[PDB]
Amino acid sequence: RFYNVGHLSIQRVAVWILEKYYHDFPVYNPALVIAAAARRRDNSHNEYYYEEAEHERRVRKRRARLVVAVEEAFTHIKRLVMDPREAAQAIFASMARAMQKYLRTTKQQPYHTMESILQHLEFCITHDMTPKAFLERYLAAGPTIQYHKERWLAKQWTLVSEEPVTNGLKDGIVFLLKRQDFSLVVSTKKVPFFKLSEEFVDPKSHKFVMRL
Amino acid sequence: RFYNVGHLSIQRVAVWILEKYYHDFPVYNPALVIAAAARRRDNSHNEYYYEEAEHERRVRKRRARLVVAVEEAFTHIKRLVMDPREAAQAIFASMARAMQKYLRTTKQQPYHTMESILQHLEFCITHDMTPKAFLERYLAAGPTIQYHKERWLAKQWTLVSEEPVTNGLKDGIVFLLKRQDFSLVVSTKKVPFFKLSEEFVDPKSHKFVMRL
């Protein structure tokens, strides 16, 4: 993601980018002579292409199964005795398998526990949220803050900067925001000086003709 | 191919099968712990499937290009001065590239020389044969006698028989008809004894009702 930022020090910029990260980027899912060798590889079976197509196809199939399952599940209850928690638990049975299989095919097992899915079912059916407003949480990757607090690890960011971090940004400052697994590479580019000119066009001067 | 044959000796049966071969089978185109290893292979990328699909797709594409090219080529002349040979040579230019590329993608280069294709163009345009009646020779593999006489090699058949070849056929006689490259395995099975029974049905006795 690209951002615009004013005159902040590199550490304040780091905190700013972290405040942006937990809702901008998708959540980090870790589960997701020489020229002659390159030429030999390029002239081989494009295995990655067909594996990607097959994976996208089976993800679409599991997504369709999940959409149908969640539509049926939410049709298995009416708004009107039974509490929203009991209703979520009663409609989760008709969708637990499809939900689990879609979370497995998209590598989303540790993000969504049965307890969190029940809490979110209760949330949705409490707030008149349709099956699609329920599945918006599970179909896409979603950003970090959407998940459990043990996956945020906000107290474990490291600011790796070639320049001292108390000095503000300038054109070309690159710095890392490292966690245990990934890192945020931040490259700075000064917003260029703009020279606007004013041109006047008469709104009546627009006159068109037939051909081409 | 399966055939029915009467009481012939194995060598006469061999000659009979050879007389059938040159117009029945397609022409021979040569250009066309352990269980753990099998399990490891079966759980790998199905490379042959996607290569076969890609080959069939590019063969269909070259076939479409060739159909269009031959339609245009035959439209480049009228029946009504110019001889059929000169007309074949004049319409071969607008289709030579597509014909060559289709013969390359289907591994049919040595079967069809430019001279034979010109002779067959002359033949077709002489006999009012449409572009599809022209392409029937080139789109499919076609049997052996359809080609040049140097690819028949009828004087180079070897009769490999476990039994003496002067004795007639019986149930289970297997024999080979070997050429330099391939071989015709011939397995004999006696046509079984049939016991017909006669049942009479009244053509007026057919009476039907509504449900199921």
UniProtKB/Swiss-Prot annotation, chains A, B:
Disease / disorder: Neural tube defects: Congenital malformations of the central nervous system and adjacent structures related to defective neural tube closure during the first trimester of pregnancy. Failure of neural tube closure can occur at any level of the embryonic axis. Common NTD forms include anencephaly, myelomeningocele and spina bifida, which result from the failure of fusion in the cranial and spinal region of the neural tube. NTDs have a multifactorial etiology encompassing both genetic and environmental components.
Subcellular location(s) of the protein: Cell membrane
Organism superkingdom: Eukaryota
UniProt topological domain (Cytoplasmic) ranges: 1-212
Protein name according to UniProt: Vang-like protein 2
Family: Belongs to the Vang family.
Complex and partners: Homodimer and heterodimer with VANGL1. Interacts through its C-terminal region with the N-terminal half of DVL1, DVL2 and DVL3. The PDZ domain of DVL1, DVL2 and DVL3 is required for the interaction. Also interacts with the PDZ domains of MAGI3, SCRIB/SCRB1 and FZD3. Interacts with PRICKLE3.
Function text: Involved in the control of early morphogenesis and patterning of both axial midline structures and the development of neural plate. Plays a role in the regulation of planar cell polarity, particularly in the orientation of stereociliary bundles in the cochlea. Required for polarization and movement of myocardializing cells in the outflow tract and seems to act via RHOA signaling to regulate this process. Required for cell surface localization of FZD3 and FZD6 in the inner ear.
Organism in which the protein naturally occurs: Homo sapiens
